[PDB]
Ligand binder design. Structure first.
Ligand SMILES: Cc1cccc([C@H](C)c2c[nH]cn2)c1C
Lengths: 55, 218, 340, 270, 233
């Protein structure tokens, strides 16, 4: 009764001091991680039968 | 080619034949599922069905044929995310009590629980069977308080033949689909043979209908 | 007097003061940024393998360590250790139970685990020289049904059940270490970070809680969905994670910016999303739906980059290896297939 | 003139290529058709394609410009295969009929006995029965005719057609009585009765009008060595050939699972 | 923890016929194929026969076929070997061997005691020379060179390093040329390429001296060499 109405208040008071990041910077990070590793992903670009043990 | 693959395909085939000869043994036997209510009647009807946490199986035998009862009520969670895992079963038992009408909306809760299983999108082929327990205990219920406590939309007599038939009539008129499955109803007794034998015969009819599902004669 | 209503209003007050503080910061949308991006092209990919060994439903799969071995589960109480090159099956494991919800494989390559409706997470060994398949341990601390469990190492495991909680066990002792209480809906699935320090849990209350491993307390709680949540996978860097729901909208949350970024809407069929998966380096989010399909969404364009062929029943589990060379789809008609 | 008619016979061969093996594929890649009553249909489709690809082009060569050639000693082998691959089809049909009788006559305690080992034993048993029928043209000794002594033709004719046809008639009459018993909200019953009446009428009727006049003309030649018109006999022989084409149509379209399998096969190119 | 039970007998004149038995306990006997390894008193190992798990594959060598018969009883957990028409050059030490063949397995990983029986073009392997002075701290490079290239584009290279301790049964050290057996220390760092092989044994301790065997398992039968033992001097 009281504890279930107290734990939510404690959770909302512990979820207040968060030094967040700019959304454009967090999108640029996801863009740069996909751009930098764009040649180590053999699923985005197909590989021949010599570079694939399947075919 | 095939340096040690001639010995590897032997292991690939041995425990693939083992899967087939162990899956046939579990696919030829018949399975019977068991819903119910909250501690209503799923302890009395399993007194004969005894022997040869979460869910526990009941593996008994009758006329040299093993049955597997799958309980439900041990799961203290929702039903929307695992009722599809219990498909492929032959008969669904939905045990209903009769003397729980006075305590509170319990019989009114079992009607919408029976409604959710007869209109389920995964159980559109398995026929359902409902029990009606406490046959001798319901006979003395009418003289103190009738069935018309919370039914202004229905009138009737105070006889035992009218009270037992209207509960059977109200449950049967809940399914929206009537072509595929057929609801079975049997009043229980205090004996040992006739309590399960009709159920025996009931499963018989289902497989006969299943054979009429196979030959195209339905 | 009667300050319990004031304590209930403090929840909405702290909500409007903290969670509704994303108006002057959450301004950058993904249309100004994703205008000058390049697509990946129409992905033409076909099935190379078809593992026809099971006789029941398959909705449990996890890869090996060197991207070689598969772990699959059926509804006959049977685990199969598949090989992905020569269509080979190595270990057939009979089970005490019969209805399996999830399975997992060790990050080293020794142990497996499986669980289901019997509330018992059974951990088995494969490297035993004496009776090659045997029971190592059988953990039991839940009262609902085990939903998803993943390994951390050869001594701990993170399990989650329908008891509105999730736990971290211990293989060396046999008891539990901690219990993550403080959840409302039924926990459905979980994913974990590749450095094994933060894990994201699923829900049926349309939330995706980021928890903590060491301290034992919750860290972040999200929202945005209007239905249940079936599958959550984690991004290979640590920034974002995807969530799949029952309203045909696969969303991509975020941890650094603390804001929902991208929605995936399929306007043709509005069936649920029961499996998600990431690729190796992003830009290819695989999604197995309920309409007998397996679609390929882009991480920045949010348009489908080609489709995959289906089965006689729904595709229920996806999988991409550690290197990114094998997609594995598992449906309920025992046809565990391996695509390009 | 005439060969275009044979081209229709060629088209007949094409349908035996189109149906039967596809039915085999409907058993091979399926989940709902993993039940062990379909091995009879697999063996029946194999028997029909062994009828077609081995017998029908040589029958077309024999009927057009009639004389026997391509070797001298192939006549006995061709007659033996022609008796074998058709008697095997008839006994697979009566085995399907007897299995459908044993499905509903004993319901519960027969599914514990219906194992695929028992099904393979019944299949190898009826192939050995067909081999026993096809052996006395091998043992005991240019127009490749069809003629043997009076002791064999009656016994082979009876054991090929007249006992399995009588068994199938009695079995499907018992099936009709059981399905009449197992029927008793009214418009779904009065049409259902006509439905299984039509099904049990077609199954028992197409077989009779497809095989019985040829065996009648084949049995009157030993009863009364009196009527040899030689016009209706070859027509009845081709009608007897026609069931190898008519078998995939009857025993598959009346089930939901085979129609769903045919739909998922024929929807993938389209 | 497992046990392998054998027996023994007396000397047999050339022209006899007997049966030998090998019993197993501690593990499931059905899921292991069974080898017979015959050791001559002149230190040279050689192979007799192999039976599979599902009783569908029986292999012999070139000079072995015809007069020998192998059988097994899985509820009894026994292995029977019937030998007919014995001679004075085919009677030696014997060994019954369990072996399993899958991906990530260890063939020839645990052998048994065996029996003693006395009287009175394969693939060429090189083992020379069995006299190398070692100290507790000196490395060693055992020479084992093959002729046929073991590069199958598979890419498993099927060479097996065995150690024979003096007085007891020999044990496996290295399986598939780059792995490590269960219960073996990490001093046996072996490598190679195609034809060349190298067994580097660094930081030696005078407790595991014996005879080093290298076995080639690309084609049947089991080819061997002559033996490579160390010495204290
Ligand atoms: C007795 C017997 C049994 C089976 C077949 C036949 C003949 C060759 C036939 C009928 N239709 C196609 N061929 C006979 C006569």
């Amino acid at each position: 009764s009281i504890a279930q109405a107290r734990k939510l208040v404690e959770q909302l008071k512990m979820e207040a001091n968060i030094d967040r990041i700019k959304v454009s910077k967090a999108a640029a990070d996801l863009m740069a991680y996909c751009e930098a590793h764009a040649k180590e992903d053999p699923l985005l670009t197909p590989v021949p039968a010599s570079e694939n043990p399947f075919r | 080619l095939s340096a040690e693959d001639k010995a590897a395909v032997e292991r690939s085939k041995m425990i693939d034949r083992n899967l087939r000869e162990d899956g046939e043994k579990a696919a030829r036997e018949v399975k019977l599922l068991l819903l119910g209510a909250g501690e209503s009647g799923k302890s009395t009807i399993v007194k004969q069905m005894k022997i040869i946490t979460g869910i526990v199986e009941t593996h008994f035998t009758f006329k040299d044929l093993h049955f597997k009862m799958f309980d439900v009520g041990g799961q203290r969670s929702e039903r929307k995310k695992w009722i599809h895992c219990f498909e492929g079963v032959t008969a669904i038992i939905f045990c209903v009590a009769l003397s729980d009408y006075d305590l509170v909306n319990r019989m009114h809760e079992s009607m919408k629980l029976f409604d959710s299983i007869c209109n389920n999108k995964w159980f559109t082929d398995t026929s359902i069977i409902l029990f009606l327990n406490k046959k001798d205990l319901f006979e003395e219920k009418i003289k103190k308080s009738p069935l018309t406590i919370c039914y202004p939309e229905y009138a009737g007599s105070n006889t035992y033949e009218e009270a037992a038939a209207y509960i059977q009539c109200q449950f049967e008129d809940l399914n929206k689909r009537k072509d595929t499955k057929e609801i079975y109803t049997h009043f229980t007794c205090a004996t040992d043979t006739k309590n399960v034998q009709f159920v025996f015969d009931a499963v018989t009819d289902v497989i006969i209908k299943n054979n009429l599902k196979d030959c195209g004669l339905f | 007097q009667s300050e319990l209503d004031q304590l209930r209003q403090e929840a909405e007050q702290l909500k409007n003061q903290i969670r509704d503080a994303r108006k002057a910061c959450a301004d950058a949308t993904l249309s100004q940024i994703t205008n000058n991006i390049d697509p990946v092209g129409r992905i033409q990919m076909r099935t190379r393998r078809t593992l026809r060994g099971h006789l029941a439903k398959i909705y449990a799969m996890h890869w090996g360590t060197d991207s070689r071995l598969l772990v699959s589960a059926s509804q006959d109480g049977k685990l199969i250790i598949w090989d992905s090159y020569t269509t080979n099956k190595v270990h057939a494991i009979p089970l005490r139970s019969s209805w399996v919800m999830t399975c997992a494989y060790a990050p080293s390559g020794n142990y497996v685990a499986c669980g289901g409706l019997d509330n018992i997470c059974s951990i088995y060994n494969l490297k035993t020289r004496e009776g090659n398949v045997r029971v190592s341990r059988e953990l039991a601390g839940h009262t609902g049904y085990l939903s998803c469990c993943r390994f951390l190492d050869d001594n701990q495991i993170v399990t989650s059940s329908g008891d509105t909680t999730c736990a971290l066990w211990d293989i060396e002792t046999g008891q539990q270490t901690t219990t993550f209480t403080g959840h409302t809906g039924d926990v459905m699935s979980l994913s974990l970070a590749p450095d094994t320090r933060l894990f994201v849990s699923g829900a049926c209350d349309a939330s995706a809680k980021l928890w903590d491993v060491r301290e034992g307390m919750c860290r972040q709680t999200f929202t945005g969905h209007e239905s249940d949540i079936n599958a959550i996978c984690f991004f290979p860097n640590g920034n974002a994670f995807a969530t799949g729901s029952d309203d045909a909208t696969c969303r991509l949350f975020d941890l650094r910016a603390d804001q929902e970024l991208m929605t995936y809407s399929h306007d043709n069929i509005i069936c649920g999303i029961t499996s998600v998966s990431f690729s190796k380096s992003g830009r290819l989010l695989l999604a197995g739906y309920d309409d007998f399909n397996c679609n390929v969404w882009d991480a920045l364009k949010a348009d489908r980059a080609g489709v995959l062929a289906g089965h006689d029943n729904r595709v229920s589990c996806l999988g991409v290896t550690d290197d990114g060379m094998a997609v594995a789809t598992g449906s309920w008609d025992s046809f565990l297939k391996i695509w390009n | 003139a005439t060969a275009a008619i044979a081209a229709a016979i060629t088209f007949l061969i094409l349908f035996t290529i189109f149906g039967n093996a596809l039915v085999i594929l409907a058993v091979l890649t399926s989940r709902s058709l993993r039940a062990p009553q379909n091995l009879f249909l697999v063996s029946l489709a194999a028997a029909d394609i062994l009828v077609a690809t081995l017998i029908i082009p040589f029958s077309l060569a024999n009927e057009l410009l009639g004389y026997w050639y391509f070797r001298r000693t192939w006549c006995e082998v061709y007659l033996a295969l022609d008796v074998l691959f058709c008697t095997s089809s008839i006994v697979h049909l009566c085995a399907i009929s007897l299995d459908r009788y044993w499905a509903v006559s004993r319901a519960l305690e027969y599914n514990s006995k219906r194992t695929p080992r028992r099904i393979k034993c019944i299949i190898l048993t009826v192939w050995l029965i067909a081999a026993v029928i096809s052996l006395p043209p091998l043992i005991y000794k240019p127009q490749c005719k069809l003629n043997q002594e009076a002791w064999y033709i009656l016994a082979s004719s009876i054991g090929s057609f007249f006992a399995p046809c009588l068994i199938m008639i009695l079995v499907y009459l018992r099936i009709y009585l059981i399905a009449k018993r197992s029927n008793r909200r009214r418009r779904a019953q009065l049409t259902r009765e006509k439905r299984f009446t039509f099904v049990l009428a077609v199954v028992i009727g197409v077989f009779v009008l497809c095989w019985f006049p040829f065996f009648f003309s084949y049995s009157l030649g030993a009863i009364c060595p009196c009527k040899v018109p030689h016009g209706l006999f070859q027509f009845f022989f081709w009608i007897g050939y026609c069931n190898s084409s008519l078998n995939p149509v009857i025993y598959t379209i009346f089930n939901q699972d085979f129609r769903r399998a045919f739909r998922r096969i024929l929807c993938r190119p389209w | 923890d497992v046990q392998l039970v054998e027996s023994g007998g007396g000397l047999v004149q050339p022209g006899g016929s007997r049966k030998l038995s090998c019993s197993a306990s501690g593990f499931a006997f059905s899921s292991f194929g069974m080898h017979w390894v015959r050791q001559a008193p002149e230190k040279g190992l050689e192979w007799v026969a192999y039976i599979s798990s599902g009783s569908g594959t029986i292999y012999y060598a070139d000079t072995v076929k015809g007069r020998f018969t192998i059988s097994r009883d899985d509820p009894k957990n026994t292995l029977f070997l019937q030998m007919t028409s014995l001679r004075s050059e085919d009677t030696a030490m014997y060994y019954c061997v369990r072996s399993i063949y899958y991906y990530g397995s260890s063939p020839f990983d645990f052998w048994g005691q065996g029996t003693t029986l006395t009287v009175s073009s394969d693939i060429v392997m090189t083992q020379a020379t069995s006299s190398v002075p070692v100290t507790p701290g000196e490395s060693v490079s055992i020479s084992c060179r093959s002729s046929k290239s073991l590069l199958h584009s598979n890419g498993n290279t099927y060479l097996y390093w065995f150690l024979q301790r003096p007085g007891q049964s020999p044990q496996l050290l290295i399986y598939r040329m780059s792995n490590l057996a269960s219960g073996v220390p990490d001093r046996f760092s072996g490598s190679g390429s195609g034809t060349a092989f190298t067994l580097t044994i660094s930081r030696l301790e005078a407790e595991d001296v014996g005879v080093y065997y290298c076995m080639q398992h690309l084609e049947y039968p089991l080819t061997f060499g002559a033996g490579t033992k160390l010495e204290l001097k």
